[PDB]
Design an enzyme around this catalytic site. Structure first.
Site, PDB file in Angstrom:
ATOM      1  CG  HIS A 150      -2.077  -1.056   0.994  1.00  0.00           C
ATOM      2  ND1 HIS A 150      -2.037  -2.287   1.615  1.00  0.00           N
ATOM      3  CD2 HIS A 150      -3.203  -1.052   0.241  1.00  0.00           C
ATOM      4  CE1 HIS A 150      -3.092  -2.996   1.252  1.00  0.00           C
ATOM      5  NE2 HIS A 150      -3.815  -2.269   0.418  1.00  0.00           N
TER       6      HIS A 150
ATOM      7  CG  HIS B 211      -7.389   3.921  -3.589  1.00  0.00           C
ATOM      8  ND1 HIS B 211      -6.342   4.082  -4.472  1.00  0.00           N
ATOM      9  CD2 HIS B 211      -7.338   2.634  -3.173  1.00  0.00           C
ATOM     10  CE1 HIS B 211      -5.684   2.943  -4.582  1.00  0.00           C
ATOM     11  NE2 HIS B 211      -6.267   2.048  -3.804  1.00  0.00           N
ATOM     12  CG  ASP B 212      -5.084   2.204  -0.532  1.00  0.00           C
ATOM     13  OD1 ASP B 212      -5.924   2.119   0.382  1.00  0.00           O
ATOM     14  OD2 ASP B 212      -4.928   1.331  -1.405  1.00  0.00           O
TER      15      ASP B 212
ATOM     16  CG  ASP C 294      -8.208  -1.236  -4.469  1.00  0.00           C
ATOM     17  OD1 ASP C 294      -6.992  -0.964  -4.458  1.00  0.00           O
ATOM     18  OD2 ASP C 294      -8.869  -1.408  -3.425  1.00  0.00           O
TER      19      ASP C 294
ATOM     20  CG  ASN D  37      -2.524  -6.062  -7.831  1.00  0.00           C
ATOM     21  OD1 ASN D  37      -2.470  -6.026  -6.602  1.00  0.00           O
ATOM     22  ND2 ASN D  37      -2.334  -4.982  -8.593  1.00  0.00           N
TER      23      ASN D  37
ATOM     24  CD  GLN E 256      -2.484 -13.977  -4.920  1.00  0.00           C
ATOM     25  OE1 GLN E 256      -3.238 -13.438  -5.736  1.00  0.00           O
ATOM     26  NE2 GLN E 256      -2.205 -13.440  -3.736  1.00  0.00           N
TER      27      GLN E 256
END
Ligand code: IHM
Ligand code: ZN
Ligand code: ZN
EC number: 3.1.4.53
Length: 331
Positions: free
Chosen positions: A79, A119-120, A237, A240, A288
């Site tokens: 983050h 946002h972060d 978001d 990934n 994952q």
């Protein structure tokens, strides 16, 4: 004088992929002297002519961007400013999907990108739950309610008050109030606790999907407009796993490092640890796969449906990556 340095030129060439899914954001982070968010944001603002449209003075835009980027923690594995830059660039590409052509106003576009950028901001590297369980000042300040997300917004907005940082100085009160509301609604929607509700609403939207003459999405009310924007930044978001494996893998390494770090603190504090955050009993590959099967795929599959077939390639990449990690699971 007047001509870019050699490193600046190499950076500029990488930035030529700004409109593509799979931008070498880590490379850009290195080339820009750890200024991925500032350069990507500036590139996008000028690409979208946002400075002229909103009369944002260039020196002001750069000052706020560098200030914002500086408030992301460079000592946080995931983050940080690179993640922010990635979410921004991903939202930028999503906004360009053919199915959403001419749909959103410049103010809504601005809201989605600004929301993505902040946002972060000032993320401590630990989750809301951890903050709540350790009686942290942040959690007490926001009453355990979407602690981090509320904080990212407050910081994102407060930074506009620093010297020559008010990029919205020329917007009318009307534009600002609308922009602020949309940005708040979007960042708050990044809180994972709201994932199921957002996905439910997105699915309902895909069910009642209705296009226009050219086959472009039709969104009347604010509720529909903002929902699509909320899910868009949410997808960015959680994008990934839909990126080329080389990128996806670096993200996993980073998130795992940040999570294991949290797990180490919980272990010391004598708190219970999730296999996810336990470096001793952790199955990265399985985690994952679960992540993709239960969260990412259901989300992206619904988004693919909404803008079908614009996201067909992104979905295929997600599925190939899912199979890669699956076959990686030892036995
Ligand atoms: C310690 C902690 O946060 N644990 C925890 C518990 C339950 C769900 C989640 C969660 C859900 C989505 N993410 C985001 C990152 C993210 C986190 C919070 N919000 O508000 C949005 C996104 C997330 C982003 C990328 C990930 O992996 C890779 F693509 F880089 C990832 O990996 C998940 C697997 C480890 C098992 C999770 N994180 C995290
Ligand atoms: Zn977040
Ligand atoms: Zn994020």
């Amino acid at each position: 004088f007047g001509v870019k340095t050699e490193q600046e030129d190499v950076l500029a060439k990488e930035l030529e992929d700004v409109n593509k899914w799979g931008l070498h954001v880590f490379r850009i982070a290195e080339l820009s002297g750890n200024r991925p968010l500032t350069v990507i944001m500036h590139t996008i603002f000028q690409e979208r002519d946002l400075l002229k449209t909103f009369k944002i003075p260039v020196d002001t835009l750069i000052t706020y961007l560098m200030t914002l980027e500086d408030h992301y923690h460079a000592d946080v594995a995931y983050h940080n400013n690179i993640h922010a830059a990635d979410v921004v660039q991903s939202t930028h590409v999503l906004l360009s999907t053919p199915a959403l052509e001419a749909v959103f106003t410049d103010l809504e576009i601005l809201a989605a990108i600004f929301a993505s950028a902040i946002h972060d901001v000032d993320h401590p590297g630990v989750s809301n739950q951890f903050l709540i369980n350790t009686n942290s000042e942040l959690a007490l300040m926001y009453n355990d309610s979407s602690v981090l997300e509320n904080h990212h917004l407050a910081v994102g907005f407060k930074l506009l008050q620093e010297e020559n940082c008010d990029i919205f100085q020329n917007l009318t009160k009307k534009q600002r109030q609308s922009l602020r509301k949309m940005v708040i609604d979007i960042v708050l929607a990044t809180d994972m606790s709201k994932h199921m509700n957002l996905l439910a609403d997105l699915k309902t939207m895909v069910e009642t999907k209705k296009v226009t003459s050219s086959g472009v999405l039709l969104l009347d009310n604010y509720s529909d407009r903002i929902q699509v924007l909320q899910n868009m930044v949410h997808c960015a978001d959680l994008s990934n796993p839909t990126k080329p494996l080389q990128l996806y893998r670096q993200w996993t390494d980073r998130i795992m490092e940040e999570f294991f770090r949290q797990g180490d603190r919980e272990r010391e504090r004598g708190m219970e640890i999730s296999p996810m955050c336990d470096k001793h009993n952790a199955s990265v590959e399985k985690s994952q796969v679960g992540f993709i099967d239960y969260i990412v795929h259901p989300l992206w599959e619904t988004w693919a449906d909404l803008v079908h077939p614009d996201a067909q390639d992104i979905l295929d990449t997600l599925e190939d990556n899912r199979e890669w990690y699956q076959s990686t699971i030892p036995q």
